Tab-separated table of N, CA and C and ligand atoms in Angstrom:
chain	number	residue	atom	x	y	z
A	15	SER	N	-10.374	135.323	128.834
A	15	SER	CA	-11.578	134.606	128.448
A	15	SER	C	-12.112	134.999	126.837
A	16	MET	N	-13.644	135.176	126.813
A	16	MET	CA	-14.088	134.583	125.428
A	16	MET	C	-13.592	134.793	124.088
A	17	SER	N	-13.401	136.027	124.067
A	17	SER	CA	-12.928	136.141	122.352
A	17	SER	C	-11.840	135.479	121.849
A	18	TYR	N	-12.123	134.594	121.014
A	18	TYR	CA	-10.758	133.766	120.664
A	18	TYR	C	-10.450	132.713	121.663
A	19	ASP	N	-11.362	132.309	122.425
A	19	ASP	CA	-11.074	131.098	123.415
A	19	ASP	C	-11.098	129.877	122.954
A	20	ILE	N	-9.917	129.011	123.028
A	20	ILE	CA	-9.475	128.052	122.211
A	20	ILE	C	-10.457	126.771	122.872
A	21	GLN	N	-10.881	126.692	123.880
A	21	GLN	CA	-11.521	125.758	124.913
A	21	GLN	C	-13.045	125.755	124.402
A	22	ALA	N	-13.774	126.924	123.648
A	22	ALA	CA	-15.162	126.776	123.408
A	22	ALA	C	-15.815	125.807	122.707
A	23	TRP	N	-15.209	125.687	121.541
A	23	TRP	CA	-15.552	124.181	120.791
A	23	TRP	C	-16.312	123.247	121.573
A	24	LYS	N	-15.403	122.816	122.811
A	24	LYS	CA	-15.927	121.942	123.348
A	24	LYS	C	-17.568	121.729	123.724
A	25	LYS	N	-17.730	123.076	124.453
A	25	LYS	CA	-18.923	123.205	124.785
A	25	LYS	C	-20.266	123.437	123.723
A	26	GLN	N	-19.521	123.815	122.568
A	26	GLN	CA	-20.560	124.178	121.249
A	26	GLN	C	-20.652	122.430	120.669
A	27	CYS	N	-19.487	122.205	120.621
A	27	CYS	CA	-19.909	120.353	120.121
A	27	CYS	C	-20.410	119.452	121.232
A	28	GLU	N	-20.702	119.783	122.471
A	28	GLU	CA	-21.570	119.060	123.295
A	28	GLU	C	-23.016	119.398	122.975
A	29	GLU	N	-23.229	121.060	122.692
A	29	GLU	CA	-24.610	121.394	122.241
A	29	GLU	C	-25.084	120.927	121.386
A	30	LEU	N	-24.334	120.775	120.139
A	30	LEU	CA	-24.783	120.554	118.889
A	30	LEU	C	-25.000	118.875	118.972
A	31	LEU	N	-24.243	118.116	119.726
A	31	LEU	CA	-24.830	116.331	119.941
A	31	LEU	C	-25.856	116.542	120.611
A	32	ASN	N	-26.289	117.374	121.344
A	32	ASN	CA	-27.652	117.182	122.300
A	32	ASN	C	-28.680	117.352	121.241
A	33	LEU	N	-28.515	118.537	120.314
A	33	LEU	CA	-29.356	118.775	119.219
A	33	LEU	C	-29.570	117.433	118.278
A	34	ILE	N	-28.641	116.950	117.817
A	34	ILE	CA	-28.557	115.691	116.756
A	34	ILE	C	-29.300	114.849	117.703
A	35	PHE	N	-29.116	114.540	119.080
A	35	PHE	CA	-29.567	113.517	119.881
A	35	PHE	C	-31.319	113.480	119.685
A	36	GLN	N	-31.783	115.160	119.734
A	36	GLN	CA	-33.104	115.267	119.525
A	36	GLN	C	-33.676	114.951	118.014
A	37	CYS	N	-32.788	115.150	117.291
A	37	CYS	CA	-33.336	114.755	115.755
A	37	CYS	C	-33.922	113.705	115.431
A	38	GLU	N	-35.233	113.288	115.050
A	38	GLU	CA	-35.609	111.961	114.817
A	38	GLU	C	-34.731	111.410	113.520
A	39	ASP	N	-34.179	112.551	112.965
A	39	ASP	CA	-33.013	111.795	111.814
A	39	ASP	C	-31.973	110.907	112.218
A	40	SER	N	-31.799	111.222	113.692
A	40	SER	CA	-30.602	110.689	114.168
A	40	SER	C	-30.715	109.190	114.856
A	41	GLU	N	-32.013	108.663	114.680
A	41	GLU	CA	-32.397	107.405	115.614
A	41	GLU	C	-31.317	106.053	115.286
A	42	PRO	N	-31.357	106.091	113.602
A	42	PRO	CA	-30.261	104.646	113.671
A	42	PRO	C	-28.833	104.978	113.651
A	43	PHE	N	-28.508	106.239	114.129
A	43	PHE	CA	-27.001	106.344	114.462
A	43	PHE	C	-26.445	106.636	115.620
A	44	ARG	N	-27.386	106.519	116.899
A	44	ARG	CA	-27.440	106.744	118.356
A	44	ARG	C	-26.313	106.006	118.980
A	45	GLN	N	-26.656	104.428	118.632
A	45	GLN	CA	-25.497	103.613	118.686
A	45	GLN	C	-25.086	102.634	118.121
A	46	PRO	N	-24.111	101.851	118.326
A	46	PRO	CA	-23.323	100.976	117.684
A	46	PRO	C	-24.182	100.319	116.968
A	47	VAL	N	-24.002	99.867	115.831
A	47	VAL	CA	-24.868	98.787	115.037
A	47	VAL	C	-24.437	97.524	115.796
A	48	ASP	N	-25.670	96.779	116.289
A	48	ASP	CA	-25.377	95.162	116.676
A	48	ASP	C	-24.929	94.455	115.623
A	49	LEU	N	-23.633	94.260	116.140
A	49	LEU	CA	-22.603	93.571	114.873
A	49	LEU	C	-23.108	91.822	115.128
A	50	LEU	N	-23.362	91.211	116.533
A	50	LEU	CA	-23.847	90.215	116.690
A	50	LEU	C	-24.973	89.873	116.162
A	51	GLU	N	-26.090	91.120	115.635
A	51	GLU	CA	-27.780	90.608	115.201
A	51	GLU	C	-27.421	91.055	113.683
A	52	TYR	N	-26.573	92.142	113.268
A	52	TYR	CA	-26.736	92.580	111.892
A	52	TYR	C	-25.464	91.843	110.870
A	53	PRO	N	-25.392	90.965	110.276
A	53	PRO	CA	-24.185	90.121	110.301
A	53	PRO	C	-23.217	90.638	109.225
A	54	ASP	N	-23.638	90.949	107.990
A	54	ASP	CA	-22.910	91.364	107.076
A	54	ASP	C	-22.455	93.122	107.363
A	55	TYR	N	-22.724	93.654	108.188
A	55	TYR	CA	-22.528	95.087	108.685
A	55	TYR	C	-20.799	95.184	108.450
A	56	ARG	N	-19.984	94.383	109.265
A	56	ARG	CA	-18.489	94.550	109.157
A	56	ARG	C	-17.813	94.121	108.022
A	57	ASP	N	-18.601	93.019	107.155
A	57	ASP	CA	-18.378	92.767	105.618
A	57	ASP	C	-17.978	93.880	104.883
A	58	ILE	N	-18.931	94.882	104.997
A	58	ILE	CA	-18.943	96.128	104.349
A	58	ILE	C	-18.139	97.259	104.970
A	59	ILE	N	-18.533	97.523	106.325
A	59	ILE	CA	-17.775	98.917	107.244
A	59	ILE	C	-16.447	98.249	108.091
A	60	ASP	N	-15.406	99.267	107.475
A	60	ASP	CA	-14.359	98.859	108.515
A	60	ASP	C	-14.132	99.562	109.666
A	61	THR	N	-14.840	101.033	109.590
A	61	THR	CA	-14.885	101.164	111.020
A	61	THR	C	-16.322	101.779	111.428
A	62	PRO	N	-16.545	101.086	112.258
A	62	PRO	CA	-17.873	101.635	112.848
A	62	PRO	C	-18.069	102.783	113.449
A	63	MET	N	-18.992	103.612	113.441
A	63	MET	CA	-18.883	104.988	114.486
A	63	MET	C	-20.280	105.133	114.562
A	64	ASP	N	-20.605	105.935	115.957
A	64	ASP	CA	-22.186	106.409	116.096
A	64	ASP	C	-21.972	107.569	116.963
A	65	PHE	N	-23.088	108.126	117.047
A	65	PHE	CA	-23.036	109.237	118.071
A	65	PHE	C	-23.082	109.246	119.341
A	66	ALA	N	-23.488	107.839	120.228
A	66	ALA	CA	-23.148	107.678	121.512
A	66	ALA	C	-21.583	107.475	121.745
A	67	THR	N	-20.908	106.819	120.993
A	67	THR	CA	-19.295	106.748	120.981
A	67	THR	C	-18.433	108.330	120.970
A	68	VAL	N	-19.235	109.346	119.841
A	68	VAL	CA	-18.624	110.333	119.599
A	68	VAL	C	-18.815	111.397	120.664
A	69	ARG	N	-19.861	111.398	121.512
A	69	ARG	CA	-20.306	112.028	122.474
A	69	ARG	C	-19.135	111.927	123.991
A	70	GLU	N	-18.949	110.435	123.996
A	70	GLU	CA	-18.325	109.897	124.972
A	70	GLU	C	-16.648	109.993	124.948
A	71	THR	N	-16.381	110.059	123.712
A	71	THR	CA	-14.930	110.469	123.438
A	71	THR	C	-14.912	111.915	123.975
A	72	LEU	N	-15.696	112.819	123.394
A	72	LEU	CA	-15.541	114.162	123.831
A	72	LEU	C	-15.764	114.427	125.235
A	73	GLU	N	-16.601	113.794	125.967
A	73	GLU	CA	-16.675	113.655	127.195
A	73	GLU	C	-15.433	113.197	128.118
A	74	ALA	N	-14.727	112.218	127.812
A	74	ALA	CA	-13.295	111.916	128.174
A	74	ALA	C	-12.414	112.701	127.607
A	75	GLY	N	-12.389	113.850	127.182
A	75	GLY	CA	-11.547	114.724	126.648
A	75	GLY	C	-10.487	114.501	125.670
A	76	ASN	N	-10.903	112.976	124.518
A	76	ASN	CA	-9.992	112.510	123.713
A	76	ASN	C	-9.985	113.052	122.487
A	77	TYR	N	-10.855	114.457	122.205
A	77	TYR	CA	-10.669	114.892	120.763
A	77	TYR	C	-9.765	116.008	121.292
A	78	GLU	N	-8.450	115.922	120.418
A	78	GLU	CA	-7.836	117.460	120.441
A	78	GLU	C	-8.391	118.897	119.904
A	79	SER	N	-9.021	118.751	118.994
A	79	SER	CA	-9.779	119.955	118.397
A	79	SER	C	-11.041	119.492	117.798
A	80	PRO	N	-11.750	120.415	117.536
A	80	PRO	CA	-13.010	120.205	116.816
A	80	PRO	C	-13.200	119.534	115.567
A	81	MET	N	-11.942	119.492	114.583
A	81	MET	CA	-11.642	118.832	113.443
A	81	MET	C	-11.567	117.217	113.653
A	82	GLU	N	-11.359	117.036	114.865
A	82	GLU	CA	-10.977	115.411	114.906
A	82	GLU	C	-12.395	114.610	115.216
A	83	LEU	N	-13.075	115.455	116.018
A	83	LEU	CA	-14.586	115.220	116.570
A	83	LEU	C	-15.231	115.345	115.072
A	84	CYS	N	-14.815	116.126	113.924
A	84	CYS	CA	-15.761	116.424	112.840
A	84	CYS	C	-15.486	115.128	111.888
A	85	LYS	N	-14.425	114.592	111.860
A	85	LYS	CA	-13.695	113.728	111.325
A	85	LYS	C	-14.756	112.435	111.741
A	86	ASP	N	-14.708	111.890	112.918
A	86	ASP	CA	-15.416	110.854	113.362
A	86	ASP	C	-17.245	110.969	112.942
A	87	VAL	N	-17.656	112.178	113.111
A	87	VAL	CA	-18.884	112.293	112.540
A	87	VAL	C	-19.004	111.958	111.050
A	88	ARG	N	-18.032	112.690	110.686
A	88	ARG	CA	-18.163	112.492	109.015
A	88	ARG	C	-18.194	111.149	108.548
A	89	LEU	N	-17.385	110.223	109.277
A	89	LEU	CA	-17.528	108.730	109.446
A	89	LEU	C	-18.703	107.672	109.386
A	90	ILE	N	-19.783	108.581	110.224
A	90	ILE	CA	-20.637	108.274	110.640
A	90	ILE	C	-21.691	107.922	109.228
A	91	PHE	N	-21.707	109.130	108.522
A	91	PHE	CA	-22.378	109.270	107.400
A	91	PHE	C	-21.867	108.869	106.068
A	92	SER	N	-20.759	108.814	106.049
A	92	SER	CA	-19.760	108.069	105.100
A	92	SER	C	-20.191	106.685	105.481
A	93	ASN	N	-20.047	106.069	106.246
A	93	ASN	CA	-20.474	104.409	106.648
A	93	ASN	C	-21.991	104.553	106.307
A	94	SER	N	-22.824	105.033	106.406
A	94	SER	CA	-24.201	105.034	106.092
A	94	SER	C	-24.353	104.823	104.648
A	95	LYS	N	-23.529	105.773	103.873
A	95	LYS	CA	-23.779	106.071	102.371
A	95	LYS	C	-22.967	104.512	101.852
A	96	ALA	N	-22.038	103.929	102.521
A	96	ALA	CA	-21.695	103.007	102.020
A	96	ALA	C	-22.423	101.504	102.190
A	97	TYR	N	-23.463	101.764	103.230
A	97	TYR	CA	-23.874	100.530	103.829
A	97	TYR	C	-25.195	100.431	103.231
A	98	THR	N	-26.038	101.832	102.906
A	98	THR	CA	-27.266	102.146	102.445
A	98	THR	C	-26.919	103.056	101.504
A	99	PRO	N	-26.476	102.133	100.096
A	99	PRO	CA	-26.042	103.102	99.063
A	99	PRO	C	-27.222	103.871	98.334
A	100	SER	N	-28.552	103.123	98.350
A	100	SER	CA	-29.611	103.588	97.480
A	100	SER	C	-30.322	105.171	97.860
A	101	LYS	N	-30.300	105.925	96.616
A	101	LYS	CA	-31.105	106.935	97.025
A	101	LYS	C	-32.761	106.892	97.127
A	102	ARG	N	-33.338	105.991	96.890
A	102	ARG	CA	-34.692	105.707	97.302
A	102	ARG	C	-34.990	104.987	98.842
A	103	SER	N	-33.563	104.742	99.599
A	103	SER	CA	-33.712	104.108	101.040
A	103	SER	C	-34.450	105.587	101.472
A	104	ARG	N	-35.283	105.251	102.765
A	104	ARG	CA	-35.655	106.571	103.583
A	104	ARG	C	-34.521	106.619	104.358
A	105	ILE	N	-33.662	105.687	104.947
A	105	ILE	CA	-32.759	105.896	105.382
A	105	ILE	C	-31.686	106.591	105.052
A	106	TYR	N	-31.196	106.356	103.718
A	106	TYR	CA	-30.471	107.384	102.955
A	106	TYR	C	-30.825	108.864	103.042
A	107	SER	N	-32.325	108.962	102.944
A	107	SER	CA	-32.686	110.196	103.177
A	107	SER	C	-32.540	110.699	104.358
A	108	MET	N	-32.867	110.023	105.518
A	108	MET	CA	-32.337	110.869	106.926
A	108	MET	C	-31.086	110.979	107.141
A	109	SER	N	-30.160	110.092	106.798
A	109	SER	CA	-28.539	110.766	106.742
A	109	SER	C	-28.280	111.519	106.107
A	110	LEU	N	-28.827	111.789	104.901
A	110	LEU	CA	-28.394	113.157	104.019
A	110	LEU	C	-29.035	114.302	104.591
A	111	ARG	N	-30.184	114.243	105.029
A	111	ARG	CA	-30.675	115.423	105.798
A	111	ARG	C	-29.877	115.799	107.187
A	112	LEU	N	-29.074	114.746	107.809
A	112	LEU	CA	-29.171	114.799	109.044
A	112	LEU	C	-27.206	115.394	109.167
A	113	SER	N	-26.705	114.798	108.244
A	113	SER	CA	-25.607	115.502	107.397
A	113	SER	C	-25.620	116.733	107.207
A	114	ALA	N	-26.640	117.230	106.341
A	114	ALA	CA	-26.532	118.704	105.860
A	114	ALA	C	-26.772	119.545	107.162
A	115	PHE	N	-27.639	119.190	108.420
A	115	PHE	CA	-27.878	119.837	109.494
A	115	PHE	C	-26.246	120.071	110.412
A	116	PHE	N	-25.617	119.007	110.370
A	116	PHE	CA	-24.407	118.863	111.347
A	116	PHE	C	-23.631	119.817	110.630
A	117	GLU	N	-23.104	119.642	109.126
A	117	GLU	CA	-22.345	120.571	108.431
A	117	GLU	C	-22.624	121.961	108.387
A	118	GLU	N	-24.167	122.223	108.612
A	118	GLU	CA	-24.311	123.988	108.674
A	118	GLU	C	-23.980	124.280	109.834
A	119	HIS	N	-24.098	123.575	111.016
A	119	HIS	CA	-23.797	123.840	112.379
A	119	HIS	C	-22.440	124.054	112.933
A	120	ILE	N	-21.514	122.896	112.441
A	120	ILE	CA	-20.186	122.730	112.524
A	120	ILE	C	-19.503	123.574	111.919
A	121	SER	N	-19.892	124.255	110.730
A	121	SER	CA	-18.993	125.240	109.899
A	121	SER	C	-18.567	126.696	110.719
A	122	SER	N	-19.496	127.347	111.752
A	122	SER	CA	-19.008	128.111	112.688
A	122	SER	C	-18.043	127.782	113.573
A	123	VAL	N	-18.179	126.698	113.978
A	123	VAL	CA	-17.564	125.972	115.150
A	123	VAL	C	-16.137	125.699	114.882
A	124	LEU	N	-15.781	125.221	113.794
A	124	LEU	CA	-14.523	124.947	112.980
A	124	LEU	C	-13.825	126.404	112.330
A	125	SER	N	-14.447	127.500	112.020
A	125	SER	CA	-14.083	128.728	111.446
A	125	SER	C	-13.888	129.626	112.841
A	126	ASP	N	-14.228	129.537	113.744
A	126	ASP	CA	-14.240	130.380	114.951
A	126	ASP	C	-12.909	129.887	115.855
A	127	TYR	N	-12.875	128.405	115.710
A	127	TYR	CA	-11.648	127.584	116.440
A	127	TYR	C	-10.286	128.092	115.449
A	128	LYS	N	-10.250	127.855	114.302
A	128	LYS	CA	-9.219	128.297	113.167
A	128	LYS	C	-8.904	129.816	113.403
A	129	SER	N	-9.704	130.591	113.626
A	129	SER	CA	-9.625	131.863	113.601
A	129	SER	C	-8.909	131.999	114.935
A	130	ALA	N	-9.474	131.812	116.190
A	130	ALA	CA	-8.571	131.508	117.507
A	130	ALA	C	-7.306	131.078	117.290
A	131	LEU	N	-7.061	129.904	116.644
A	131	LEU	CA	-5.654	129.427	116.284
A	131	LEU	C	-4.328	130.163	115.647
A	132	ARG	N	-5.145	130.891	114.557
A	132	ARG	CA	-4.338	131.829	113.694
A	132	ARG	C	-4.278	133.213	114.904
A	133	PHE	N	-5.179	133.510	115.570
A	133	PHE	CA	-4.709	134.667	116.456
A	133	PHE	C	-3.672	134.389	117.331
A	134	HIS	N	-3.875	133.519	118.249
A	134	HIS	CA	-2.877	133.042	119.460
A	134	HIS	C	-1.238	132.729	118.730
A	135	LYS	N	-1.545	132.050	117.522
A	135	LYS	CA	-0.297	131.934	117.027
A	135	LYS	C	0.568	133.091	116.213
A	136	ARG	N	-0.337	133.825	115.778
A	136	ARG	CA	0.270	135.379	115.446
A	136	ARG	C	0.953	135.954	116.733
A	137	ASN	N	0.395	135.770	117.865
A	137	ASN	CA	0.666	136.729	119.031
A	137	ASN	C	1.295	136.225	120.360
B	222	5QB	C1	-27.233	96.774	109.835
B	222	5QB	O1	-27.975	98.038	109.382
B	222	5QB	C2	-29.239	98.217	109.668
B	222	5QB	C3	-30.182	97.107	110.225
B	222	5QB	C4	-31.192	97.353	110.241
B	222	5QB	C5	-32.026	98.761	109.928
B	222	5QB	C6	-30.963	99.642	109.990
B	222	5QB	O2	-31.267	101.178	109.718
B	222	5QB	C7	-32.284	101.477	110.542
B	222	5QB	C8	-29.669	99.740	109.574
B	222	5QB	C9	-28.823	100.736	108.700
B	222	5QB	N1	-28.059	101.291	110.245
B	222	5QB	C10	-27.043	101.781	109.959
B	222	5QB	C11	-26.536	102.499	111.155
B	222	5QB	O3	-26.181	101.768	108.861
């Protein structure tokens, strides 16, 4: 049980996504971009990603580790910077704040998971 629990990341990521869903800054990133309505999005973005897809992928058990989840969430933010490159866009600003919040909170989820990993690999 809980010391170096290698499953704990799952619940912690579910909680973090819940917080993200609550932030007004996530509003543009909650659902896939409507690709039949916003035409050039796919001209610019190779692999769309959004927080509802991340939440569903976690709920389905299809993330092997919190590093996989982290990769998808990072893709949301890199996509925004590619599609909305301008520092004066308020949407650029939203993405930037929300990314900082995510990176702050995911930090301990990753180090705890890796700690656990190195513990059980050692013993
Ligand atoms: C097609 O992209 C659009 C279209 C309208 C508004 C808008 O910003 C709310 C965006 C940018 N959305 C993302 C997720 O990059």
